[PDB]
Amino acid sequence: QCGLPSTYSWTSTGPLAEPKDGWASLKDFTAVPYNGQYLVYATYHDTGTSWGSMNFGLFSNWSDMATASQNAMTQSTVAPTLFYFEPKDVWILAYQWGPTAFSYLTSSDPTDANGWSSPQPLFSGSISDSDTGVIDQTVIGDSTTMYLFFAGDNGRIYRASMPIDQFPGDFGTESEIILSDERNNLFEAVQVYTVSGQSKDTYLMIVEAIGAQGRYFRSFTADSLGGSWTPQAATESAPFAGKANSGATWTDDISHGDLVRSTPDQTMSIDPCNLQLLYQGRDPSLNPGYDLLPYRPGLLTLK
Ligand SMILES: [Ca+2]
Ligand SMILES: [Ca+2]
Ligand SMILES: [Ca+2]
Ligand SMILES: [Ca+2]
Ligand SMILES: [Ca+2]
């Protein structure tokens, strides 16, 4: 068994895939182990003004991601969260910019980018002091409760909860603000995981921040998903993952993605002995506007 360190240091792959022809970027990755392989969903931006979602074909090795297929979704599930909700034998794809503040689709075969149900409401509430409104949800459960976490591009991280029996369902309208900092410091792309192999419940939160050298992640930890969060690696010079410690040669940004989860279920479990981050990065010298930033997947592996 292993523990999470209070500071982090990684090595990185190069960019793992080029976007489908006609797309500018692949973003906001969510991944699960599936069939002994990896199943990845993502945001895309085209080479014009439009957003969508996609999945990759199954692939076994991270170096196979470059030749995995890229499958555009008919239902746009921007900034998706993929997981298997084991208690009801159902796969969940949570996302934003759907019919309500957050939405989810259901499926029995998550490999089919276009085999999902029509949307169901995941969250119908709003937040104060945000120009974007709610963004970048994730969903995670323990033995009693399912939790919704999200951001607001406003320095704040939010949480909603429901008894686990009630899921899949709408978390409702209410949320609690659980962290608040400068806007750049707790910006977006929040993720929460159960650290496996621990003698007491241990949860890891990462939040994307805007740094002087680029996008990076700050980490927080908690003893309970419904408890308070304490900063862990939470500065740009000693971050969870960023230019300071990523070993990434092709990107300064370490941005919206997913730690590599050890199982696909709602506990969002990670193996601290084999910590890896599937992130979005981009060539530092290409800085177009219009949301055309050429984000690509990359993989950090914890030393
Ligand atoms: Ca985004
Ligand atoms: Ca089951
Ligand atoms: Ca996400
Ligand atoms: Ca209210
Ligand atoms: Ca509230």
Curated annotation (Swiss-Prot):
One GO cellular component from the entry?
Answer: extracellular region
User: What Gene Ontology molecular function terms does this protein carry?
Assistant: alpha-L-arabinofuranosidase activity
The protein's annotated catalytic reaction(s) are:
Hydrolysis of terminal non-reducing alpha-L-arabinofuranoside residues in alpha-L-arabinosides
Q: Keywords for this entry? A: Carbohydrate metabolism, Glycoprotein, Glycosidase, Hydrolase, Polysaccharide degradation, Secreted, Signal, Xylan degradation
Reading the lineage from the top rank, the first entry is: Eukaryota
Q: How does activity depend on temperature?
A: Optimum temperature is 47 degrees Celsius.
Record keywords: Magnesium included? no
Query: InterPro entries from the xrefs?
Result: GH62_arabinosidase (IPR005193), Glyco_hydro_beta-prop_sf (IPR023296)
Residue ranges crossing the lipid bilayer per the database entry? none
Q: Which residues are glycosylated?
A: 61
Per the UniProt entry, what are the Gene Ontology biological process annotations, in alphabetical order? arabinose metabolic process; L-arabinose metabolic process; pectin catabolic process; xylan catabolic process
Q: How does activity depend on pH?
A: Optimum pH is 5.4.
- Cellular compartment(s): Secreted
Q: Which residues form a coiled coil?
A: none
Function in brief = Alpha-L-arabinofuranosidase involved in the hydrolysis of xylan, a major structural heterogeneous polysaccharide found in plant biomass representing the second most abundant polysaccharide in the biosphere, after cellulose. Releases L-arabinose from arabinoxylan.
- What protein family is recorded? Belongs to the glycosyl hydrolase 62 family.
- This protein's name: Alpha-L-arabinofuranosidase axhA-2
Source organism of this protein record: Emericella nidulans (strain FGSC A4 / ATCC 38163 / CBS 112.46 / NRRL 194 / M139)
Taxonomic classification: Eukaryota, Fungi, Dikarya, Ascomycota, Pezizomycotina
